[PDB]
Every structure is written in structure tokens, then in C-alpha cells.
Amino acid sequence: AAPKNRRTIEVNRCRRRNPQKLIKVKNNIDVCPECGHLKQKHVLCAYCYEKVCKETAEIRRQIGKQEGGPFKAPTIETVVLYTGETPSEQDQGKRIIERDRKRPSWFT
Amino acid sequence: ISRKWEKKNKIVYPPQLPGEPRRPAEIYHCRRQIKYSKDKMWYLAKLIRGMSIDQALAQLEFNDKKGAKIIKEVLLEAQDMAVRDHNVEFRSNLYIAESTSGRGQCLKRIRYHGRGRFGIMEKVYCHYFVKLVEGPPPPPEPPKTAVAHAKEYIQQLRSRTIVHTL
Amino acid sequence: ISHGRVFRRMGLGPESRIHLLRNLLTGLVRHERIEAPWARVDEMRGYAEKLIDYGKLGDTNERAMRMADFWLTEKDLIPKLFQVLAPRYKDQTGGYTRMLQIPNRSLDRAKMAVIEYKGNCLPPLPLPRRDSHLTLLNQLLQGLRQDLRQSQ
Amino acid sequence: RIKDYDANFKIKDFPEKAKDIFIEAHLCLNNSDHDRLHTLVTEHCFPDMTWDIKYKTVRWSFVESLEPSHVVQVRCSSMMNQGNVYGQITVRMHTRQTLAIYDRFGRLMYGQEDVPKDVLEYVVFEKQLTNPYGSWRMHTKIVPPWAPPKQPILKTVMIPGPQLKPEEEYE
Amino acid sequence: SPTELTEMRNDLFNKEKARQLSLTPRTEKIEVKHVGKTDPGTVFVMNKNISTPYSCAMHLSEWYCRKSILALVDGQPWDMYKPLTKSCEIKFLTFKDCDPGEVNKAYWRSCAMMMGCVIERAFKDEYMVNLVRAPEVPVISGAFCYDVVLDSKLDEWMPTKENLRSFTKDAHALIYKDLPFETLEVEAKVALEIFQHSKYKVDFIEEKASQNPERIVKLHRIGDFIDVSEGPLIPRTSICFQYEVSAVHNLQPTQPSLIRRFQGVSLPVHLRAHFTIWDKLLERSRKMVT
Ligand SMILES: [Mg+2]
Ligand SMILES: [Mg+2]
Ligand SMILES: [Mg+2]
Ligand SMILES: [Zn+2]
Numbered sequence: 001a002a003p004k005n006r007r008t009i010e011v012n013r014c015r016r017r018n019p020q021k022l023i024k025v026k027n028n029i030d031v032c033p034e035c036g037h038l039k040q041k042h043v044l045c046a047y048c049y050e051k052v053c054k055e056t057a058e059i060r061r062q063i064g065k066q067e068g069g070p071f072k073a074p075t076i077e078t079v080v081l082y083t084g085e086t087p088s089e090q091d092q093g094k095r096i097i098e099r100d101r102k103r104p105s106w107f108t
Numbered sequence: 109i110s111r112k113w114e115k116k117n118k119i120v121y122p123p124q125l126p127g128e129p130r131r132p133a134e135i136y137h138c139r140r141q142i143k144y145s146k147d148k149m150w151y152l153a154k155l156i157r158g159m160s161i162d163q164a165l166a167q168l169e170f171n172d173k174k175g176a177k178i179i180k181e182v183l184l185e186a187q188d189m190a191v192r193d194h195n196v197e198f199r200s201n202l203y204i205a206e207s208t209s210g211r212g213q214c215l216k217r218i219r220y221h222g223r224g225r226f227g228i229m230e231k232v233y234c235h236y237f238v239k240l241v242e243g244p245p246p247p248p249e250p251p252k253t254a255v256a257h258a259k260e261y262i263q264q265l266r267s268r269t270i271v272h273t274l
Numbered sequence: 275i276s277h278g279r280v281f282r283r284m285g286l287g288p289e290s291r292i293h294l295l296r297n298l299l300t301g302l303v304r305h306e307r308i309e310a311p312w313a314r315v316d317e318m319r320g321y322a323e324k325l326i327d328y329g330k331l332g333d334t335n336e337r338a339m340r341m342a343d344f345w346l347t348e349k350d351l352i353p354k355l356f357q358v359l360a361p362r363y364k365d366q367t368g369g370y371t372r373m374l375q376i377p378n379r380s381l382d383r384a385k386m387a388v389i390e391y392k393g394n395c396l397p398p399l400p401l402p403r404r405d406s407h408l409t410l411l412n413q414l415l416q417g418l419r420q421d422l423r424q425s426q
Numbered sequence: 427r428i429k430d431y432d433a434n435f436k437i438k439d440f441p442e443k444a445k446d447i448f449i450e451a452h453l454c455l456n457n458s459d460h461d462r463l464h465t466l467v468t469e470h471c472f473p474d475m476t477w478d479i480k481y482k483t484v485r486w487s488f489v490e491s492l493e494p495s496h497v498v499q500v501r502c503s504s505m506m507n508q509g510n511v512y513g514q515i516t517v518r519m520h521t522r523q524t525l526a527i528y529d530r531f532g533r534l535m536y537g538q539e540d541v542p543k544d545v546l547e548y549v550v551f552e553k554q555l556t557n558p559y560g561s562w563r564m565h566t567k568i569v570p571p572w573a574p575p576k577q578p579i580l581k582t583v584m585i586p587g588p589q590l591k592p593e594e595e596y597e
Numbered sequence: 598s599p600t601e602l603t604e605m606r607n608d609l610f611n612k613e614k615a616r617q618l619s620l621t622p623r624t625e626k627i628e629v630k631h632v633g634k635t636d637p638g639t640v641f642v643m644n645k646n647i648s649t650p651y652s653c654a655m656h657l658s659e660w661y662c663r664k665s666i667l668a669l670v671d672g673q674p675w676d677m678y679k680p681l682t683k684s685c686e687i688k689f690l691t692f693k694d695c696d697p698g699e700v701n702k703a704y705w706r707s708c709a710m711m712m713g714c715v716i717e718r719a720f721k722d723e724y725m726v727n728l729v730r731a732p733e734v735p736v737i738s739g740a741f742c743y744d745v746v747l748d749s750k751l752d753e754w755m756p757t758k759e760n761l762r763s764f765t766k767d768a769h770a771l772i773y774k775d776l777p778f779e780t781l782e783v784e785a786k787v788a789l790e791i792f793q794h795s796k797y798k799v800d801f802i803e804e805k806a807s808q809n810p811e812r813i814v815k816l817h818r819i820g821d822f823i824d825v826s827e828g829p830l831i832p833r834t835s836i837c838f839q840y841e842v843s844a845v846h847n848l849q850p851t852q853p854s855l856i857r858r859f860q861g862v863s864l865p866v867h868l869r870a871h872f873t874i875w876d877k878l879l880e881r882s883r884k885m886v887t
Contacts, residue, residue, distance in 0.1 A: 016147070023155040023173075029166050031660050033693065034400065036635025038660075040170055044388075046377045048400040051592035055397045056307070071350040073304060075357045078395035097395075105595070107397045123483055123532040131531040162659040172383045195529045197581045200655045200662070405693050410701045411868045413736045418881055420737070578626050582648055584656040587631070587638030596637045 034106075055104065062097050109213070113138050113237055117194075133196045133242035137186040138235055141212050144175045146234035149209035152179055153236065160245045161187055161202040179236060186240055196242050203245035208237040282317060295321055300347045302371075303355065306394040312375065312385035319373055319389060321345070326370045329360040362393060374399060427502040428513055431555040441495040443562065444517045444551060451564055452486045455479060468552055468565045482535075485526040489542040493520035498548070502555070511555040514565065520546050535580055543577070599722065606791055606823050610816070613787050621646045629653060632686040643681060651677050651832070653687060664867065665689040666831060667700055674699045676780045677832035692867045701736045707778060707817075707831040708863040709741040712842060714822040715768045716745060716859060724748040729797040729856070733827060740843055740862040740882030746797065747857055756845050764842040768861075775835040776820040785812035791823060801825055831865075838866040839875055843882035860886060 015021070029038060032045040039045040059080055067073070077094040079087065082103040087096060116136040124131060142149070152175050156164040161183065168180045190196045212233030219227040284291040298318040302308045303325075310318075325345060331338040333356050342352045363370050373389045388399060407416065428435050447466060454463040455475065467475065495517055503512040522542040529535045548568035554560025590596060625645035631637060631653075641653045650668035654661035654677075667690040668675040674690075690700050709731035720726050727746035734742060747754070785806035792798040802825060805814045817826045819834065842861035862882035864870055870878065 017154075021151075023151050023171070025155070026167060026170055029170065031635075031664065034634070036633075038166055038169055042375060044374055044376045044400055047592060049376055049388075052397050052399060054593045059396065060305070071348065073348070073350050073354050075353050077358060077362070080395055104397070118481060120481055120483065120530055121532045123485075123528040123534065131533060133529075133531060160659060172378060195531075195533070195535055195581070198652075198655045199584075200657070200659050406695050406697070408695070408701075409697055409868060410692060410704060410736060411864065411870060413701065414862075414864075414878055414881075415874075417737050417739065418877060421881055421884075578624055580624070582626075582644055582652065582656075583642045584653075585640045585642070587636065587640070 051106075055107065059097065062099070066095075066097065133190065133194050135186055135190045135194050135196075135202075135240040136238075137182060137189070137240075138237045139178065139182050140235045141233050142175065142178055142236060143231075144178070144234055145232045146209050146211045148173070149175050149234050149236060152176055153207040153209050156204050157207045158245060158248070159204060160200075161204070161240065162200055164204055175236075179238075182236060182238060186238055190240055190242070201243055202240045203243075205239040205241045206237070207239075210235040210237065282313060284314070284317065296345055296347065299325065299345055300351070302389060302391065303346060303351045303359070304348065307388065307390035307396055307399075309376065309386060309388050311379075312387040315373055315387035315389045319371055322371050322389070322391075323368065325355070326359060326363055329355045330363070332356065332360070359391070372399075374401070428500070428555070431511070437497060437500075440515070440562075441497060441517060444549070445491070445495050445519070447562070448519065448549065448564060449488050451475075452488070455484050456486050465561070466563055468563045471563075471565055481530050483528040483532065485524075485528070485539075487524040487540075489522045489524060491519070491521040492544060495519045509556055513553050513555050515551050516568070517549050517551065518546075519549060520544075537577075546573075602794065603821060607821060609787075609791055610781065610818060610823060613783060614781055617781075617783075618646070627681060627684045629681070629685055629687045631688065633688045641687075646680050646682065649678050649680055650675060650687060650689065654689060661689060664691050666691055666836070666865075667703055667829060674703065674829045676778070676829045678777055679780050679829075692865055703829050704831055704836075704863075704865060705734065705736055705741045706731070706826060706828055708837060708840070708861070709743050710778075710817060710824050710826060710830065711768065711771055711819060711834065711837075712741065712859060712861055713743040713745075713824060714819055715764060715771060715842075716743065717822070719764060719767060720747075724751055727795055727797055728824075730801050730825075734886065739884050739886040740860045742858050742860045742886060745857045745859055746854060752855060761842055761844070764861075765840070768840050768842060771819075772834050772837050772840060774820070775833055777833050778830045779818040780830070781816050781818070782813055783816065785814055788814050788816060788825070791816065792825070798825060836865050837863050838869050839864045841879060843879060844885075846885045858885075
């Protein structure tokens with residue numbers, strides 16, 4: 001079917017600008033106590049998560065170097081190590097991954 | 109094309125006498141030719157329309173719409189220049205005075221329908237405008253009380269005249 | 275009408291549904307932590323937990339081997355399942371996987387969840403932490419607890 | 427090497443000329459007359475004079491001088507460029523001035539209204555010796571390393587620390 | 598007469614504040630470094646005896662001002678609205694901090710102050726109200742308390758539940774006004790000029806003057822009411838969201854002079870309890886605390 005008459009600006013302005021079609025204010029925002037950036041509650045801090053994922057990205061890169069080719073996932077557990085630290089007695093008998101930097105504060 | 113909004117930052121007022129209220133600082137800023145619909149931009153403009161800078165940046169951060177990051181940029185640019193050039197003491201004590209989107213210049217392409225028929229498609233562009241006023245944001249007008257309704261009704265009855273006499 | 279419909283329809287049909295979930299599960303096994311759409315993470319999550327229980331049955335179980343064969347596409351992960359993952363979760367009876375909601379995807383604006391198997395080698399996810407016991411409200415509640423215990 | 431070019435230069439009477447030229451330059455800044463300033467101040471100097479002053483009001487005044495102005499050194503160039511001989515003469519001036527700078531909204535942002543404070547300044551003057559239409563103009567200021575800091579500003583500031591990318595730690 | 602007394606004390610407070618303001622030569626730029634976990638190495642170039650931790654906060658963001666309750670200046674608790682003295686390291690303290698020990702202490706100290714404020718102006722002039730002090734009480738204890746001497750006429754008088762609800766709404770009114778807690782640190786003498794009428798405040802001032810090597814004492818003003826405090830307070834009254842004056846208890850060895858310990862419990866806006874939980878907290882504050 002086809003419109004029988006042009007809708008006026010006022011009619012349209014009532015459609016468009018009612019509270020239903022408006023953007024609602026979010027009330028669940030907070031400050032990330034860790035980094036001090038803004039995070040939504042119920043959601044992980046975007047900054048903090050990026051930080052983790054950049055670290056874990058590099059760890060996965062070192063995993064590839066040592067593994068060296070597809071279909072070579074080991075049958076032991078894994079541990080990650082940084083500059084100036086040694087595997088414990090219980091750490092013995094599992095895969096070691098080395099690093100060229102200091103251990104992060106948040107990663108313990 | 110007109111570019112009035114830019115020039116608004118070049119207005120110089122003469123120095124105030126010590127016996128005067130401290131004039132709020134005043135920053136006008138915009139972005140032109142945003143590839144986004146002007147009416148779509150309106151909703152985001154309308155949202156931040158009366159809030160403080162930080163509170164607007166907060167609201168804009170978690171907003172999913174495309175233009176939301178664009179407005180965030182404009183606001184941060186405006187805040188930066190406010191402190192640097194417009195002699196604003198604190199960056200936090202700014203609120204959005206007016207937030208407006210205009211139609212920018214548009215192009216026309218063709219859309220190919222069935223049979224031989226076609227239509228004229230428009231690559232939509234728009235501008236965004238903002239104004240920042242130094243100081244705490246204005247407290248919203250309180251909702252009208254029963255006593256206020258009553259008060260004004262009394263006023264209204266008292267305004268009656270005997271009509272079409274001397 | 276669809277009350278108490280448990281599984282959510284996913285791919286281009288039930289066969290595809292399984293296939294997507296199997297891919298997700300394969301990834302998670304291998305890498306131990308995976309970002310994917312919130313619905314799909316939630317959906318796959320259950321099959322991930324059920325896989326550890328089959329893994330707990332052991333290499334010797336022929337049924338469990340056939341299951342692992344289907345659900346792991348890499349075939350090199352099957353030893354890992356049975357000699358790494360199953361031994362790791364010996365104590366716990368359940369609750370091997372954790373899922374969290376992270377910021378929405380940039381391109382798509384989709385809800386995104388990270389899922390990881392617990393006790394992995396990787397750097398730990400920023401996790402929601404309840405406020406310290408030394409907070410004003412917690413101290414007042416600890417006060418009330420003191421009253422009740424010391425009354426008898 | 428000045429005299430051979432002009433032959434009507436006196437070292438005795440120049441300091442007064444240097445003084446009044448200084449004052450009228452600052453009066454130019456006050457009323458925002460750039461044309462007179464150009465006749466009066468070199469092309470090196472003018473950007474340093476006027477880059478900040480635009481979109482704000484200056485209220486500069488000259489109070490009586492303490493120590494009379496005197497020349498400290500005179501030096502001349504030796505044909506570094508074709509048809510160009512320049513002459514730099516340096517004057518020490520010790521005087522009290524008043525200054526106020528207002529904001530774009532006219533809010534007093536620096537200095538005081540009408541109370542003088544003493545200043546010691548070293549000023550350099552250039553002339554085109556070759557050019558017949560060349561004129562003595564203020565060229566620059568010399569700041570001593572031992573000079574006391576400029577009087578403090580009205581507002582408070584924040585200096586931002588390093589803005590760290592997620593993959594960085596503060597030192 | 599009390600109505601003139603209150604305004605007299607204000608005039609005296611104001612003139613001392615003006616005196617302390619005037620001895621500052623124009624403005625000296627002090628440097629303050631942010632030593633917080635968040636946004637590190639920020640340096641604020643502040644006015645010497647003018648700028649506050651609040652001013653530093655409001656350089657950063659509204660999130661600081663909204664959720665900043667105390668300051669550490671060289672690792673000492675410092676009022677939000679207290680003007681600084683010298684260059685230092687500054688960090689801000691919130692309620693949801695790991696160790697909010699100092700923050701909790703400051704909160705209760707402030708609530709007790711405003712309870713005393715509302716009690717004073719709750720009775721008619723024919724009766725005598727005498728505020729003595731607010732003793733230091735652990736937050737893990739039932740509630741905050743202020744000790745009061747009333748008239749000999751009201752020796753038999755015990756407050757009813759309706760009277761308690763009356764105080765409740767009265768203190769609530771104060772919160773609604775949203776009054777900043779102005780602070781002033783002075784020598785003992787000028788403070789004695791402020792409080793010479795009540796001896797119960799005279800000796801307390803003398804106590805603080807004696808214990809400190811200097812004769813410095815802290816006076817906290819909430820709009821009009823001046824009171825002697827033992828440490829730093831909360832910035833504004835708005836911080837409180839729940840506030841009920843729970844009970845009044847008579848102390849036992851009070852044959853020479855009766856002491857009435859007013860008790861009430863409060864929670865700040867950031868840490869608000871559900872209806873049921875708050876109710877059980879009121880129950881505990883009804884018990885006499887020592
Ligand atoms: Mg065709
Ligand atoms: Mg069209
Ligand atoms: Mg679909
Ligand atoms: Zn964070």
C-alpha cells in the first residue's frame with residue numbers, strides 16, 4: 001500500500017523524539033580500582049583485559065617456537081618462567097617456557 | 109558552505125571591573141563531513157546535551173553506535189584546548205551547553221532495481237557541533253508541584269475581567 | 275511457543291550446531307582459553323565440562339575413547355585430554371571451566387565471553403573481586419556476627 | 427664600521443632613542459597596532475611579541491626609570507650575505523614597569539593592575555647599514571642565567587604523567 | 598543567650614580564618630605528586646595555602662571528587678577541604694579501598710559530630726543542654742556516640758521512640774542541606790576564646806593542647822555549628838545516606854552529674870544496605886556500647 005498524504009514535521013517530530021526511541025542513560029558504570037579506567041560493572045575492564053591478552057599473546061608465541069610444528073601438543077603440564085627465576089621441585093617434570101623480561105606485578 | 113561556528117572562539121570581551129561576577133569560559137568546537145546520518149547523530153547529541161564533560165565521556169564510552177567514538181574524540185579535543193588556550197583552570201568542571209548535528213554535503217550514486225528501473229542513493233554526511241561552559245552543570249528544573257499548579261490556577265481566576273462592558 | 279527448550283539453534287541446522295561447538299571445544303582444549311560470542315561460549319561450555327568427565331573415565335574405557343575421537347579434531351589433543359586434563363581435575367567433582375563477560379566486539383557489536391579451563395599456565399584473567407572484610411559495612415556485619423556468637 | 431656607512435651616528439645620544447623606541451613598541455602591543463610595530467621592530471622579534479598576545483588584552487605601562495640606560499657592547503657583521511651589512515648594539519635598561527594580561531573573557535590572568543615592579547633587561551638593536559632606508563629596531567632580549575624567575579601566575583596547573591599503553595609499567 | 602552565642606562564635610571563627618589567610622604573601626607555587634596506583638607521576642602546581650586535595654581531585658576527574666573521602670599527605674590523614682602548606686606526595690582514599698581503616702574512623706567521627714549538632718538545637722531554651730565530647734569508638738562496636746549533660750529539670754526525663762524519630766528526621770534535614778565540613782587548625786588560646794562558656798569543652802581543648810608539643814587543635818565547622826574534633830572528617834554531609842539516632846543511655850556512676858550517651862548508627866551513600874540488613878544493624882546500636 002502507498003501513503004495517502006505527506007506526514008508533517010510535527011507528527012514526525014513526535015514519533016522520533018519520544019523517550020521510547022531515545023538513547024537511555026547507563027547507570028552501571030564504575031572506575032576500575034586496578035588501573036583507574038572506566039569499566040562497566042558485570043563486565044571485565046577493557047584496559048586490564050587488553051593487558052592480559054598481550055602478555056598471553058607473547059606466551060603463545062614462545063609455545064609455538066618450542067613446539068615447532070602442528071600436532072605436537074605435549075603430554076605434560078606447562079609452566080611459564082621469567083628472567084632470574086628457577087623451577088621448583090614440583091615444577092620438575094613439566095614443560096618450561098622462558099622469557100626475556102621481568103615478571104609482571106599482577107601475574108604471580 | 110558557512111563556517112560561523114569556528115569563528116566563535118575569536119571573540120574577545122573587554123576586561124571586567126572587580127565589581128562583577130566571574131564570566132564563565134566558553135568554547136565552541138565542531139567536526140565537519142562525518143560519514144554518518146545527521147538524524148542518527150542527533151540521538152547521540154541529544155543524549156549528552158546537559159551533562160558534565162566526564163559524565164558525557166562515560167556515557168559515550170559504553171555506547172555502541174558508530175558516531176559515539178567520533179563525538180568522544182571531539183569532546184576530548186575540546187577539553188584539551190579549553191585547558192590549554194581558553195584559560196580554564198580545571199578540566200573536570202565543564203558541561204555540554206549545546207550539542208547539535210547538521211547536514212553535511214552529500215553525493216549521489218545510483219541504485220539498480222529490477223526491470224530497468226533505478227533510484228538515487230545519497231552518501232550521507234553530517235557535522236557535529238559542541239559548546240562547553242566552564243563551571244558546574246545547571247541543576248535540572250524541578251517537576252511541577254501540586255502547590256505550584258494550585259498557585260497558578262488561583263492567579264488565573266483572578267485575571268478575569270467582565271468582558272464587553274465599560 | 276517454546277517452554278523448557280534447552281538447546282539454542284545455532285548454525286545452519288543441528289548438524290552445523292554440533293560442528294561449531296566441536297570447533298570451539300577443540301580450540302579450548304588446545305589453547306586453554308578462548309574468546310567467542312557469548313551465546314556460543316555458554317552453549318559449548320556444558321559440552322566442555324561433560325568432556326572432562328568422559329576424560330576421567332580413562333584411556334582404557336573404549337566408550338570414552340570413541341567420544342574423545344569425535345569431539346577433538348586434532349587427534350593430538352586426545353593424549354593431552356587423558357594425560358593432562360583428567361589428572362588435573364582429580365579432586366573437584368565439577369566446575370572445571372569459568373566464563374566471564376568482556377567488552378563487546380568492535381566490528382559486530384556482539385556480546386563476547388572468555389572461557390578458560392581452571393588452573394591453566396596462562397596469565398590470570400582480571401576477575402570480579404568482592405570488597406574487603408575491613409569495609410565499613412562488613413565491619414558492622416562482623417559486629418552483628420560477634421553479638422550472636424557471644425550471646426551463647 | 428657604523429660611521430663609515432652613516433657618518434651621523436653618536437653613541438652619546440642613542441640610549442634615549444633606544445629607550446623611547448622600547449616604550450612605543452610596548453604601547454603598540456597595548457593598542458594592537460601592528461603597522462607601527464613593523465616600522466619599529468625586526469621580523470625576527472615580531473613573532474615572539476605577538477604569538478600569545480592575540481585573543482587577549484594587554485595593559486602595559488611605563489613607570490619612571492631607576493638606572494639610566496647605557497650601551498654595553500656594539501658588534502657588526504662582516505658580509506655573510508650579498509649586499510647585506512647588519513649592526514647589533516646592546517643596551518642595558520633598568521626600570522620599573524606595570525603589566526596586566528587579561529583572558530579572552532577579560533579575566534585577569536597575570537600581573538597586577540597599577541602597582542610597579544622593577545625589571546632589569548638587556549636589549550639588542552639591529553640596523554641595515556647597506557640599505558639607505560634601514561632603521562634601528564629592537565631585535566631581541568638577552569635573558570641572564572642568574573635572573574630571578576618571573577612572578578608566579580594566578581591559576582594552578584596539572585602536569586600529566588606518562589600515559590601508559592597496557593603493555594607498559596611506570597618507573 | 599544561645600542564639601547570639603552561636604553567631605558570636607562564627608564571627609570569631611571568621612576573623613581568625615581571615616587572619617590566617619592574610620599572612621600568606623600573594624601565592625607560592627607548591628608541587629604535589631600523585632603517588633596513587635592510578636594515573637602515576639602527575640604533578641599539580643598548587644597555591645600554597647589555598648588549594649586543597651579537592652582541587653587536585655578536580656584536576657583529574659569527577660570520579661575522584663565523587664569517590665574521594667580522605668587524603669594522605671606524606672602518609673598522614675588529611676581533610677579533603679583542608680588547604681595545604683608545603684610540597685608533598687598525595688594520594689586519595691575511598692570507602693571501597695583494601696584497608697579503609699582511616700576512612701571508617703573519619704566517617705564515624707563526623708557522624709558523631711553532626712549528631713551533637715542536631716541534639717543541641719533540638720531542645721527549648723528553658724532546659725539546659727551541655728555537650729561534653731564524642732569518645733573514640735571502634736567501628737566494629739555497635740554505633741557512634743556523643744555524651745551530653747542535660748538540665749537537672751530533666752533528671753527523670755527519658756526520651757520516647759517518637760522523640761527518637763524526631764531526632765532522626767532532624768538529622769536527615771541536615772544531610773539534605775549538604776553542608777561542607779570546614780576545618781581550621783589554630784593555637785589553643787584563640788580556641789579558648791571560642792569555647793569559654795562550657796567548661797566541658799574547655800578542659801578537652803586543654804587536653805589536646807597538652808598532648809601535642811605545639812598548642813595546635815582542630816575545630817570543625819558544619820555551616821554554623823563549631824565543634825572540637827580529635828582528627829580529620831568527611832568532606833560533605835551528603836556522604837551519609839542512612840542516619841538514625843538509635844537510643845540514649847544513662848551511665849551508672851553519675852550521682853555528681855548525670856551523663857547521657859546518645860547513640861546512633863549511620864552508613865555512607867556508597868555503602869548502602871538493604872532494608873532488612875539496616876534494620877538488624879539498628880537493633881545492635883540499641884544496645885549500650887562501652
Ligand atoms: Mg538488464
Ligand atoms: Mg533519498
Ligand atoms: Mg542464525
Ligand atoms: Zn582496569
